[PDB]
Ligand binder design. Sequence first.
Ligand SMILES: O=C(O)CNC(=O)C(=O)O
Ligand SMILES: [Cl-]
Ligand code: NI
Ligand SMILES: [Zn+2]
Lengths: 348, 4
Amino acid sequence: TLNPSARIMTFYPTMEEFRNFSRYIAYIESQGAHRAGLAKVVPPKEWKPRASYDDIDDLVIPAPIQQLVTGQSGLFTQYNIQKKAMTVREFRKIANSDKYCTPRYSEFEELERKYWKNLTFNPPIYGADVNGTLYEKHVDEWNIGRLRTILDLVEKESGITIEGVNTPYLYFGMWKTSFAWHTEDMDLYSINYLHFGEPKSWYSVPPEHGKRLERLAKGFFPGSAQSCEAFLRHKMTLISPLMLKKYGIPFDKVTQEAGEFMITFPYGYHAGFNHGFNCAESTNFATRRWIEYGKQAVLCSCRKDMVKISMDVFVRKFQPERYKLWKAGKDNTVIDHTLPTPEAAEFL
Amino acid sequence: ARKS
Ligand SMILES: O=C(O)CNC(=O)C(=O)O
Ligand SMILES: [Cl-]
Ligand code: NI
Ligand SMILES: [Zn+2]
């Protein structure tokens, strides 16, 4: 098959390939990129989303989060504390500060070792979930603010705006700030652009193994699992690569550098950390292939106002011949995680 | 409802 090793792939589009976003996503799926659950896309050298990052010092981070982490033997739970609002300027000064700055290191493996060794000490501040875009109005290629995929149907046909899902979010990171193991809301795709600063490292589990990771997590955290089946959607659970390896969960790792895109795929579990002060922009998107994942997604029961997207409009428009069955609860379709989105047909 |  295409990428039978399910290893994270990197792509280097020309400007002409880069211009149509949905089409290029269909292309990288025709190359098997989706099997890893994560892919890197390096934009053309000529392309920039913004001329300068030195005029954003006045941007407000309304709800910075201090990340407290408790655990041992590769298994941790992360607790957020909302701090008072601060500007990018203040944040940047705390991030580049000596008590929170990146430690000295040679190779990525050393930094990774220090991350997993020091995870629970000196809790950092994450500049997370900031509504906004650092793109300039005029940039029409891979603009995270408007990607023009079928996810837009939630807005255009239904008038529903879900912040960070069909709208962009900014993330100002510092060393050791983390994102816990999760798939996207409604098992959507996500896109992530690192605007500037130090790298972001990522771990990914192939969608075809996602259930193995869930059973693993349920084993380690039975109480959490008993309270909510989808408790990983709480984005509190950290699990080291050593534990993944010990229990035989296939995974891959990759480091994203400023100027690079990461794409996560439906039901791709991923987690990671920031190397130092940086800024990333992201949102969710969809393709036709997502619709079945959306229909099957297991959602958090226990919490108030979690993201729940009505699938009705999608089934109605793109699967009319299955709509009656689906409404009746009789749609028994089984997802094959290896298959590319239909749109890939012309490349295959 | 939003992302968190
Ligand atoms: O940037 C972060 O903190 C984590 N990003 C994601 O999980 C994503 O883009 O899908
Ligand atoms: Cl537990
Ligand atoms: Ni994510
Ligand atoms: Zn829950």
